Amino acid sequence: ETGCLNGNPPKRLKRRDRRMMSQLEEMLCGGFYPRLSCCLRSNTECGKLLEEIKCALCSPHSQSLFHSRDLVLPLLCKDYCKEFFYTCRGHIPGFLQTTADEFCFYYARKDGGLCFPDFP
Ligand SMILES: O=S(=O)(O)OC[C@H]1O[C@@](COS(=O)(=O)O)(O[C@H]2O[C@H](COS(=O)(=O)O)[C@@H](OS(=O)(=O)O)[C@H](OS(=O)(=O)O)[C@H]2OS(=O)(=O)O)[C@@H](OS(=O)(=O)O)[C@@H]1OS(=O)(=O)O
């Protein structure tokens, strides 16, 4: 069930809509969500991972992902949470004071349902 954080449904990028985007110079997390996005209407290893999590707001399932340290993160997948923790351990402060199992118990989903990354 799709839905955005503002309480409105995601927006579809049609045939006429994509022809405009192709002529403009790429934008609004197109690489992860080109067709259905919530951002349409209203260099290090850790950096790339933070850029992905930044794009979780544009996800057509952003409402389901963000709503269940004071760290605002979407419900991550078991493998990705573990990956993000170790890659951003020296860069994010509180990460060195905890373990991967402890961090992913509160920030990752063990249910087996929808989790971030949405995209493959
Ligand atoms: O032609 S469009 O598909 O681009 O739709 C044009 C505008 O329709 C609204 C409001 O409806 S209206 O008042 O009757 O004009 O929303 C409609 O579109 C979304 C899907 O997004 S999409 O990219 O426009 O296709 C529907 O949501 S959902 O079915 O995917 O859940 C809306 O359904 S609903 O209101 O949530 O029930 C649908 O409305 S309706 O069924 O046609 O009535 C506008 O969206 S709005 O600006 O957020 O109010 C669209 O305007 S827009 O400028 O293209 O954004």
Author numbering: 36 to 60, 66 to 82, 100 to 125, 133 to 184
Sentences from the paper on this structure:
Hedgehog-Interacting Protein (HHIP), the only reported secreted inhibitor of Sonic Hedgehog (SHH) signalling, binds directly to SHH with high nanomolar affinity, sequestering SHH. HHIP is composed of an N-terminal domain (HHIP-N) that shows weak sequence homology to the cysteine-rich domain (CRD) superfamily, typically involved in small molecule-binding. Our data suggest a multimodal mechanism, in which HHIP can bind two specific sites on the SHH morphogen, alongside multiple GAG interactions, to inhibit SHH signalling.
The structure of the HHIP-N:SOS complex was determined using the single anomalous dispersion (SAD) method from native sulphur atoms. A multi-crystal approach was taken in which 24 data sets were collected from 8 isomorphous crystals, utilising both mini-kappa and inverse beam strategies to maximise the observed anomalous signal. This allowed us to determine the structure of HHIP-N in complex with SOS at a resolution of 2.7 Å, with one molecule in the crystallographic asymmetric unit. HHIP-N possesses an elongated globular fold with a unique N-terminal GAG-binding domain (GBD) and a C-terminal CRD. The HHIP-N CRD is composed of 5 helices (α1-α5) stabilised by three intra-CRD disulphide bonds (IV: C103-C152, V: C141-179 and VI: C145-168). Each HHIP-N molecule interacts with 3 SOS molecules. SOS is bound to a positively charged surface localised to the HHIP-N N-terminal domain, forming electrostatic interactions with a cluster of 6 basic residues and burying a total surface area of 594 Å2. Mutagenesis of SOS-interacting basic HHIP residues (marked with asterisks in Fig. 3d) were previously observed to weaken the interaction between HHIP and heparin, validating our observed HHIP-N:SOS interface.
